[PDB]
Structure formats: C-alpha cells, structure tokens
Scaffold this motif. Structure first.
Motif, PDB file in Angstrom:
ATOM      1  N   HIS A 192       1.153  -1.011   0.042  1.00 51.79           N
ATOM      2  CA  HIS A 192      -0.093  -0.031   0.045  1.00 51.79           C
ATOM      3  C   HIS A 192       1.096   1.266   0.045  1.00 51.79           C
ATOM      4  O   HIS A 192       1.660   1.441   0.973  1.00 51.79           O
ATOM      5  N   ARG A 196       0.983  11.159   1.779  1.00 58.10           N
ATOM      6  CA  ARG A 196       0.002  12.159   2.161  1.00 58.10           C
ATOM      7  C   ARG A 196       0.731  13.463   2.601  1.00 58.10           C
ATOM      8  O   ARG A 196       1.416  13.658   3.345  1.00 58.10           O
ATOM      9  N   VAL A 203       3.062   6.948   3.289  1.00 61.11           N
ATOM     10  CA  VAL A 203       2.774   5.805   3.965  1.00 61.11           C
ATOM     11  C   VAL A 203       2.953   4.526   3.376  1.00 61.11           C
ATOM     12  O   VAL A 203       2.303   4.331   2.140  1.00 61.11           O
ATOM     13  N   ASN A 205       2.509   0.117   3.619  1.00 58.30           N
ATOM     14  CA  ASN A 205       1.922  -0.905   4.569  1.00 58.30           C
ATOM     15  C   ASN A 205       1.527  -1.845   3.955  1.00 58.30           C
ATOM     16  O   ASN A 205       1.524  -2.228   2.565  1.00 58.30           O
ATOM     17  N   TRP A 212      -4.284  -4.213   9.015  1.00 56.69           N
ATOM     18  CA  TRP A 212      -2.986  -3.222   8.684  1.00 56.69           C
ATOM     19  C   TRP A 212      -1.787  -3.580   9.395  1.00 56.69           C
ATOM     20  O   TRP A 212      -1.883  -3.901  10.358  1.00 56.69           O
ATOM     21  N   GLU A 215       3.554  -0.117   9.368  1.00 57.76           N
ATOM     22  CA  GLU A 215       3.434   1.065   8.732  1.00 57.76           C
ATOM     23  C   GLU A 215       4.787   1.823   8.510  1.00 57.76           C
ATOM     24  O   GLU A 215       5.578   2.100   9.357  1.00 57.76           O
TER      25      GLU A 215
END
Ligand SMILES: OC[C@H]1O[C@@H](O[C@H]2[C@H](O)[C@@H](O)[C@H](O)O[C@@H]2CO)[C@H](O)[C@@H](O)[C@H]1O
Length: 278
Positions: A192, A196, A203, A205, A212, A215
């Motif tokens: 993922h 941001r 991020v 992950n 999840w 991270e």
C-alpha cells in the motif's frame, strides 16, 4: 553525439495507430554545452514521403532561450506561439505531449507549460520525429484516460520477481492524499503506497487478512502537488524497490510471498496518465 546506445537522430517513428485523446508522447534526452536547438514533430505524411502536414512542431531553442510551437499545413506555417526555455545548454530535458480532444498539453520537467489548441486534425498525426542537438535516452508513446479510482488485473504473471510496474501520475493541485495498492488474489495488499501531503510523508504498509501492519514512513516526500511523477515499483528478491522520478525513494521488505501479485488499485486525489509493466 558522444555515445550511441539507441534512438539515434534524426529519429523517426510510424505510429501503430493515429494519436488519440488521452495518449502521451514522452521524450527524454541529454544536450551538450554546445547544443543550439532540437525539434520534436508530430507529422502526417504517408510512410516515408516526409513533407506533408505537421500538426505540432516544437522547437527548443537555446540561442533564443524559448520553446516555440507551430503548425505546418497546406504548404504554409502558421503563427508561432512561445514560452520560456527553462533549460541551460547541457543538462537533461524531459518533454511530454498529451493529446486531448481540443488541444495538446505540453509539460516540461513534468510541469505543464503550454496548452496548444488543435489547428488541424489530431488524426492527421501518423508519425513523430526528433532531431537536432540532443542525445535521446527515452521515448514512449501510449497511455489513455485512466479513470480514478482505478482497478485492474496485472497480466498473467503480474508484478513477478525481476519485473517492475511503472505508473505515470500527477497528484492533484489541491489534493491531500492518494494511494496505490498492489494486491494478491485474496484481496490482501502486498504493498500500500500512500502519499500524504497533509502529513508530508508517504505511508507504506500491507493489508493481511483484513488487518493493517506496522507502517513504514519517513524519507521526505519527493512528490509535489500539480507536478507529474514517474513511480516505479520493482519486485526484487528481498523487497520492493520504490523509485520516484528515477531515484530510489525506499525499499519495502516483502511481508507476503512475492509472486502472484496480479491486482492493482489506484485511488485518492491523483490523475493517472500511464501504467506499464516493465
Ligand atoms: O500505516 C499505514 C496504514 O494507515 C492506516 O491508517 C492509520 C493511520 O495512518 C494512523 O495514523 C492511525 O493511528 O491508525 C490508522 C489505522 O487505524 C490505514 O487505515 C491503512 O490502510 C494503512 O494506510
């Protein structure tokens, strides 16, 4: 003109099919301390006649310090339109031309600098050429209008070891965040990738069985709102190597067995202009 490699000038290419709205022509190269100018042309002609219409002519001038655009048709040139040339003799160039239904959008160094309204039919473009004081290092034509959120499967082999997924995108000018998911058949997300801007970090992950993981962030965000970027996810032996604009941004140790990564999702505040498996 010091080295060869590939893409020797004068360079000419016949399109498989006419240039269509949503497609982008990317041209990258190097110039010399003595370079004066080079040109990029979207031309008509039959197959090698050379001399027909030129829907879009781009002249990068180091002498005048300008990038000049024009069209040639019915044996005559129109009125030239100009923009500043941000390049100094030497150092690399990156020019991208995206076709739309009413104009060509031209970016220089991934920044949109010119909207050239069509003066003659875009469908007249059957070839493209590059010539002048430039050593071409990369050329690609393709892409389409990718709707976002986006979702698709990845070939049959998918993002297998030794392969890389290349994504051309532009974070929205006033967007906050966007993401790219590389998934497996069961819905688990191997990686993922989540830039941001509000948190000034990307991020990374994994989503396994609906949960999840740790991270991984930090590394200073190399992306910028409104500027195009080249994202490359290289599936290597021990981890994904994430490249941003030709520079390794980070590595991400595999948490799920590589292989069988056959799913892709893209969402958030971003515009996608190209996706390729290299
Ligand atoms: O860390 C990647 C992970 O973030 C989840 O959201 C996190 C958020 O980043 C964190 O600040 C907060 O404390 O916990 C949230 C989860 O409850 C996303 O939901 C997930 O998809 C990943 O992107």
């Amino acid at each position: 003109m010091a080295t060869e490699t590939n893409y020797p000038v004068p360079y000419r290419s016949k399109l498989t099919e006419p240039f269509e709205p949503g497609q982008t022509l990317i041209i990258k190269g190097k110039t010399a301390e003595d370079s004066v100018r080079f040109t990029i042309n979207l031309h008509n002609t039959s197959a090698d006649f050379s001399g027909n219409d030129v829907p879009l002519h781009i002249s990068v001038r180091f002498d005048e310090g300008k990038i000049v655009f024009n069209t040639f048709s019915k044996g005559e040139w129109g009125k030239e339109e100009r923009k500043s040339n941000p390049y100094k003799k030497g150092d690399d160039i990156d020019i991208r031309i995206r076709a739309h239904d009413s104009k060509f959008s031209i970016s220089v160094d991934q920044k949109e600098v010119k909207e050239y309204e069509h003066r003659v039919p875009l469908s007249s473009v059957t070839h493209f050429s590059v010539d002048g004081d430039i050593l071409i290092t990369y050329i690609h034509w393709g892409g389409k209008y990718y709707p976002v959120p986006y979702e698709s499967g990845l070939a049959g082999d998918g993002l297998a070891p030794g392969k890389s997924l290349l994504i051309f995108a532009t974070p929205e000018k006033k967007g906050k965040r966007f993401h790219i998911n590389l998934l497996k058949k069961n819905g688990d997300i191997a990686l993922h990738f989540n830039p941001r801007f509000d948190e000034k970090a990307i991020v990374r992950n994994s989503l396994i069985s609906g949960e999840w993981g740790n991270e991984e962030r930090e590394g200073k965000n190399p992306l910028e709102k409104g500027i195009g970027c080249d994202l490359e996810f290289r599936n290597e032996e021990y981890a994904f190597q994430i490249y941003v604009d030709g520079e390794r941004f980070a590595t991400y140790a595999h948490r799920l067995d590589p292989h069988d990564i056959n799913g892709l999702q893209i969402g958030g505040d971003v515009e996608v202009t190209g996706i390729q498996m290299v």
